[PDB]
Design brief:
The structure is a homodimer.
Chain A lengths: L1 E5 L7 H9 L4 E5 L2 H6 L1 H5 L7 E4 L2 E4 L1 H12 L6 H27 L1 H24 L15 H16 L8 H11 L2 H8 L1 H4 L10
Parallel strand pairs in A: 1-2
Antiparallel strand pairs in A: 1-3, 3-4
Helix pairs in contact in A: 1-4, 1-7, 1-9, 5-6, 5-7
Chain lengths: 208, 209
């Protein structure tokens, strides 16, 4: 039914994989090594010359957030109504903004930039704590009282930041509890513990 | 009006959503924030991610330019005819966003030193949208399907600002060129694009374009 085409890294597929696993969906992983990519043929066929590429039957998609939104739309993980859908997008766009900064650090400026990045991190995380505080005291999900694709993306963002800056959630009780709660969902817990996840590096350059 | 746009006195990340509203004949209010007012700090501190645009739809307050686009897309029926088309609309918009981020980085962080390399790389960055047009009714309608979507307005803005940056950049892309001409000629949009409301704002906030 579903196929994920990507490099052997967590990266921009981590959240959509968590979503699929937690939702009890089956999918095929099509692994593309850097050597295979460097040949050029698959890259030339990709819409924006990049991975992930995703297949849902005869539908082929590119763009990690398009894949998330598609799964959210088709699986009912996109809020209860239009108002919640907009809030879901607002969270996801915020997650994407911080992910872009994280990626820039990892791949272009790790040694020289890490200190300033970590110093700035609390101010980058506080909006998500605020979002939780304004939704049922943070006891459920990031938007409303059902899970959305933005929860999986935010969860991944938080997990990778815990590796980059251990203790970065200690000042944020709602985010800390939210990470624990979501990570304990049975199917997700099983996936996060699986070698499929654990034995992939977070990024492609050995930095985290 | 039920809609309010809160932004700096520039086109920037509100240009597409304004084009959308104008072309759809929807009324809205502009609340202008000067750099002076912004530097005071109170509005900024109240913004979810410390940034503008801020958007109000009745008592619904939104941040994030693409969130605003998607919201208006949903509520005004500019988000495809079915679930498959909606995904394709997202795929276009995400591509537009990726290039817009590169454009913004050039404008604000590296204009003089980076422009030549950027313009050299531009055809490769525009080609995917030409490809999308070529695979949809010979490029004679919209970017996805046979009705306009929020992605059309965002793509259109992206193309317009790149024509200012790199005049003639669409000479290599007949479908994109015709597409810009066609959408820009839509009566309400044409009127808006010619109006002081649009013309008298700079594209960006630093005087570069
Ligand atoms: N906006 C894209 C970015 C994807 C991207 O940056 N792809 C990287 C891997 S995560 C890639 O394919 N790099 C190989 C290349 O550019 O040649 C998304 O969200 O999917
Ligand atoms: N991801 C945001 C980016 C918004 C953004 O970069 N805002 C700029 C203006 S376009 C800003 O508010 N800068 C002022 C500041 O950061 O203090 C969006 O798409 O709305
Ligand atoms: O999000 N990324 O920028 C990103 C994700 C995953 C990877 S894994 C390896 C991909 C292949 C290398 C790039 C093409 O020679 C990245 N390598 O460089 N940037 C990467
Ligand atoms: O998309 N942008 O990076 C962007 C948009 C609009 C503007 S307009 C002026 C905003 C005020 C900047 C704050 C100065 O203390 C930008 N100025 O710097 N980056 C800007």
């Amino acid at each position: 039914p579903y196929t994920v085409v990507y490099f052997p890294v967590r990266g921009r597929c981590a959240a959509l994989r968590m979503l699929l696993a937690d939702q009890g969906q089956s999918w095929k992983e099509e692994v593309v090594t850097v050597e295979t990519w460097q040949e050029g043929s698959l890259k030339a066929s990709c819409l924006y010359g990049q991975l992930p590429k995703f297949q849902d039957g005869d539908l082929t998609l590119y763009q990690s957030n398009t894949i998330l939104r598609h799964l959210g739309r088709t699986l009912g993980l996109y809020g209860k109504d239009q108002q919640e859908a907009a809030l879901v997008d607002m969270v996801n766009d915020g997650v994407e903004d911080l992910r872009c900064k994280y990626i820039s650090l990892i791949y272009t400026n790790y040694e020289a930039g890490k200190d300033d990045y970590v110093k700035a991190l609390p101010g980058q995380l506080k909006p998500f704590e605020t979002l939780l505080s304004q939704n049922q005291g943070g006891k459920t999900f990031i938007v409303g009282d059902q899970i959305s694709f933005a929860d999986y993306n935010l969860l991944d963002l938080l997990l990778i930041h815990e590796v980059l800056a251990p203790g970065c959630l200690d000042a944020f009780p709602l985010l800390s509890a939210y990470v624990g709660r979501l990570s304990a969902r049975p199917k997700l817990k099983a996936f996060l513990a699986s070698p499929e996840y654990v034995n992939l590096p977070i990024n492609g350059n050995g930095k985290q």
